[PDB]
């Protein structure tokens, strides 16, 4: 049980990482940038997740 | 350091005097919705090249 | 190549902090128990309040 | 104002007059027609919204 819940904890905690993108909040990038560049940014972040 | 005011970032973008307008930060038209925590305006004059 | 260009750089320190300056977008009162597409100074999420 | 006509720009020349899609595929062509377009009458017959 410890190892399973700890794996899930790591999985959820992984969401705070920018993975090289502009930020981790996906909606912040949407508000900041335009679709023609949110394209590549979201691409990096999505391939990371 | 400008702070605690409202900025007309729509019309600022509208004056066609701007010849080199590179908004590496965010997309220009989207300067309106987000709230900037603080801001600096570093002004000077340089070469044309 | 040598026509002097007046250049202004506007650095925005965008992060989670007390919002000082942003655009003149019209606010509106809150709601409770009804999920809404709120924008609380960049916090462009969704949910009930 | 020719370099602005491209998918990924906004302005009087990029969207207000005529747009380019973010999935466009093709070729833009620009050249210096300042020979014939130079009109002693001031060539004011060329308009845009």
Swiss-Prot record, chain A:
Residues 1-42 form a coiled coil. Subunit of the fusion protein that is processed upon entry into the host cell. Mediates fusion of the virion and cellular membranes by functioning as a class I viral fusion protein. Contains a viral fusion peptide that is unmasked after S2 cleavage. This cleavage can occur at the cell membrane by host TMPRSS2 or during endocytosis by host CSTL. In either case, this triggers an extensive and irreversible conformational change that leads to fusion of the viral envelope with the cellular cytoplasmic membrane, releasing viral genomic RNA into the host cell cytoplasm. This is Spike protein S2'. The lineage of its organism: Viruses, Riboviria, Orthornavirae, Pisuviricota, Pisoniviricetes. The gene is S. The chain holds residues 952 to 1000 of 1273 of the full protein.
UniProtKB/Swiss-Prot annotation, chain C:
Residues 16-38 are annotated as: Disordered. This is Spike protein S1. The gene is S. Attaches the virion to the cell membrane by interacting with host receptor, initiating the infection. The major receptor is host ACE2. When S2/S2' has been cleaved, binding to the receptor triggers direct fusion at the cell membrane. When S2/S2' has not been cleaved, binding to the receptor results in internalization of the virus by endocytosis using host TFRC and GRM2 and leading to fusion of the virion membrane with the host endosomal membrane. Alternatively, may use NRP1/NRP2 and integrin as entry receptors. Binds to host ACE2. RBD also interacts with the N-linked glycan on 'Asn-90' of ACE2. Cleavage of S generates a polybasic C-terminal sequence on S1 that binds to host Neuropilin-1 (NRP1) and Neuropilin-2 (NRP2) receptors. Interacts with host integrin alpha-5/beta-1 (ITGA5:ITGB1) and with ACE2 in complex with integrin alpha-5/beta-1 (ITGA5:ITGB1). May interact via cytoplasmic c-terminus with M protein. May interact (via N-terminus) with host bilirubin and biliverdin, thereby preventing antibody binding to the SARS-CoV-2 spike NTD via an allosteric mechanism. Changing residue 44 to K: In strain: Omicron/BA.1. Changing residue 2 to H: In strain: Omicron/BA.1, Omicron/BA.2, Omicron/BA.2.12.1, Omicron/BA.2.75, Omicron/BA.4, Omicron/BA.5, Omicron/BQ.1.1, Omicron/XBB.1.5, Omicron/EG.5.1. It comes from the Viruses.
